[PDB]
Design an enzyme around this catalytic site. Structure first.
Site, PDB file in Angstrom:
ATOM      1  N   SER A 234       1.919  31.659 -14.859  1.00 50.94           N
ATOM      2  CA  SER A 234       2.057  31.217 -16.247  1.00 50.94           C
ATOM      3  C   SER A 234       0.826  30.888 -17.088  1.00 50.94           C
ATOM      4  CB  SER A 234       3.047  30.040 -16.312  1.00 50.94           C
ATOM      5  OG  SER A 234       2.809  29.095 -15.282  1.00 50.94           O
ATOM      6  N   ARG A 235      -0.167  30.228 -16.497  1.00 53.87           N
ATOM      7  CA  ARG A 235      -1.371  29.839 -17.236  1.00 53.87           C
ATOM      8  C   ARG A 235      -2.333  30.965 -17.630  1.00 53.87           C
ATOM      9  NH1 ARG A 235      -4.189  26.382 -12.400  1.00 53.87           N
ATOM     10  NH2 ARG A 235      -4.945  28.100 -11.076  1.00 53.87           N
TER      11      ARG A 235
ATOM     12  N   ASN B 120       2.909  34.458  -6.353  1.00 50.27           N
ATOM     13  CA  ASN B 120       2.124  35.528  -5.739  1.00 50.27           C
ATOM     14  C   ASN B 120       1.637  35.224  -4.320  1.00 50.27           C
ATOM     15  OD1 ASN B 120       1.359  38.251  -6.106  1.00 50.27           O
ATOM     16  ND2 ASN B 120      -0.793  37.647  -6.411  1.00 50.27           N
ATOM     17  N   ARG B 121       2.403  34.392  -3.618  1.00 46.90           N
ATOM     18  CA  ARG B 121       2.143  34.039  -2.223  1.00 46.90           C
ATOM     19  C   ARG B 121       3.517  34.039  -1.561  1.00 46.90           C
ATOM     20  NH1 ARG B 121      -1.913  34.250  -4.287  1.00 46.90           N
ATOM     21  NH2 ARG B 121      -3.964  33.312  -3.843  1.00 46.90           N
TER      22      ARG B 121
ATOM     23  N   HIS C 264      -3.308  39.897 -13.666  1.00 54.32           N
ATOM     24  CA  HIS C 264      -3.671  38.481 -13.618  1.00 54.32           C
ATOM     25  C   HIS C 264      -4.991  38.274 -14.375  1.00 54.32           C
ATOM     26  CE1 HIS C 264      -1.087  37.450  -9.978  1.00 54.32           C
ATOM     27  NE2 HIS C 264      -1.107  38.769  -9.911  1.00 54.32           N
ATOM     28  N   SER C 265      -5.478  37.038 -14.335  1.00 49.34           N
ATOM     29  CA  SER C 265      -6.768  36.653 -14.905  1.00 49.34           C
ATOM     30  C   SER C 265      -7.139  35.402 -14.102  1.00 49.34           C
ATOM     31  CB  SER C 265      -6.664  36.335 -16.405  1.00 49.34           C
ATOM     32  OG  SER C 265      -6.164  35.035 -16.657  1.00 49.34           O
ATOM     33  N   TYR C 266      -8.426  35.092 -13.949  1.00 48.60           N
ATOM     34  CA  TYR C 266      -9.557  35.847 -14.490  1.00 48.60           C
ATOM     35  C   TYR C 266     -10.499  36.191 -13.331  1.00 48.60           C
ATOM     36  CZ  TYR C 266     -11.765  31.370 -13.576  1.00 48.60           C
ATOM     37  OH  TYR C 266     -12.238  30.242 -12.951  1.00 48.60           O
TER      38      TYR C 266
ATOM     39  N   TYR D 124     -10.854  36.962  -1.117  1.00 47.32           N
ATOM     40  CA  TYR D 124     -10.622  36.200   0.103  1.00 47.32           C
ATOM     41  C   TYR D 124      -9.279  36.567   0.716  1.00 47.32           C
ATOM     42  CZ  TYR D 124      -8.383  33.682  -3.730  1.00 47.32           C
ATOM     43  OH  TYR D 124      -7.665  33.378  -4.864  1.00 47.32           O
TER      44      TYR D 124
ATOM     45  N   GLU E 239      -7.572  41.814 -12.605  1.00 49.33           N
ATOM     46  CA  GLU E 239      -7.938  40.431 -12.913  1.00 49.33           C
ATOM     47  C   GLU E 239      -8.756  40.588 -14.195  1.00 49.33           C
ATOM     48  OE1 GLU E 239      -7.216  37.413 -11.329  1.00 49.33           O
ATOM     49  OE2 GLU E 239      -8.028  37.487  -9.292  1.00 49.33           O
TER      50      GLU E 239
END
Ligand SMILES: O=C(NO)N[C@@H](Cc1ccccc1)C(=O)O
Ligand SMILES: [Zn+2]
EC number: 3.4.17.1
Length: 307
Positions: A70-71, A144-145, A196-198, A248, A270
């Site tokens: 969301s963010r 996303n996990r 996604h970002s960033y 990672y 990203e």
């Protein structure tokens, strides 16, 4: 306001405004776009996907989702611009027209509607879903996990209060399962792109294991080409490679799941930036970010059509 031609693409919008936009786009281009409800969020909000099709039964398709976190506002804002661009370039741009004449594109602009609404009303930096679970006063799961790909392994948190909490079990979040079911039922997706970002990165599988994918050579070259295309506009520099080697170890990611389902062209973008603004990217960068990202996305689509 009352025409996608009058809509302000250079500013951030609320959930209602984005949903209204979808209805206007569909009303303006009935022969090209339709709105599908693939499920409902934890709090009951409808989950919509925009289908861009030129015809056919179950033509090979391209999946694109944004806003699973969301963010990362720049993603939903880019999705809105993408939706409008698709309707503007079909029949005008030779490359894109060729793509839509043979394949369908599915665009999910607000993948996590509950979290998105929450970023507007209470916590601008909320990242997870909004589901609640008895054994904890903390809310939400990192969507996303939560996918069935190395679920629960290194790269995700087991504490419910964590920003990377994976949830009780794979696909526990309705927002995730809604996509899984639709993709499985369809059975003909050729590309799966999650935005996604960033960080300004173009990633491919895997994140949960150090094992190299069988199509590493091809995907690495596709990513190399997409990054060069994206950079050609404003000079924005992107890095690329597998998730685990670039950022990672991360388990339960969407792209790892889709690749394991046989969807070869699985990539995660990203977007901007590399930390100056982070999630609070200025509205003045919405259009430029969307414009260059489109070049990278188009590159991947072109490869998919001819392969
Ligand atoms: O959301 C962000 N922001 O940088 N990054 C991704 C990184 C990622 C991408 C693909 C698969 C697994 C992990 C995240 O889900 O944390
Ligand atoms: Zn994210």
């Amino acid at each position: 306001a009352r025409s996608t031609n009058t809509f302000n693409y250079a500013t951030y919008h609320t959930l209602d405004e984005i949903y209204d936009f979808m209805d206007l786009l569909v009303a303006q281009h009935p022969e090209l776009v339709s709105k599908l409800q693939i499920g409902r969020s934890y709090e009951g909000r409808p989950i919509y996907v925009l289908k861009f099709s030129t015809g056919g039964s179950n033509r090979p398709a391209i999946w694109i989702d944004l806003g699973i976190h969301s963010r990362e506002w720049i993603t939903q804002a880019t999705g809105v611009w993408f939706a409008k661009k698709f309707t503007e370039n079909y029949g005008q741009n030779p490359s894109f027209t060729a793509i839509l004449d043979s394949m369908d594109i599915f665009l999910e602009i607000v993948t996590n509607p509950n979290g998105f609404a929450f970023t507007h009303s209470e916590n601008r930096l909320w990242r997870k879903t909004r589901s609640v679970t008895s054994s904890s006063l903390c809310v939400g799961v990192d969507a996303n996990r939560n996918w069935d790909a190395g679920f629960g392994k290194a790269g995700a948190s087991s504490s419910p209060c964590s920003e990377t909490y994976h949830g009780k079990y794979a696909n526990s979040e309705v927002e995730v399962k809604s996509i899984v079911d639709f993709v499985k039922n369809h059975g003909n997706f050729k590309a799966f792109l999650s935005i996604h970002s960033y960080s300004q990165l173009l990633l491919y599988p895997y994140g949960y294991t150090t094992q190299s994918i069988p199509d590493k050579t091809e995907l690495n070259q596709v990513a190399k080409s997409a990054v060069a295309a994206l950079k050609s506009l404003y000079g924005t520099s992107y890095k690329y490679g597998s998730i685990i080697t670039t950022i990672y170890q991360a388990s339960g990611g969407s792209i790892d799941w889709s690749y394991n389902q046989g969807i070869k062209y699985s990539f995660t973008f990203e977007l901007r930036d590399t930390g100056r603004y982070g999630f609070l990217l200025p509205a003045s960068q919405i259009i430029p970010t969307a414009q260059e990202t489109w070049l990278g996305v188009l590159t991947i689509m072109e490869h998919t059509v001819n392969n």
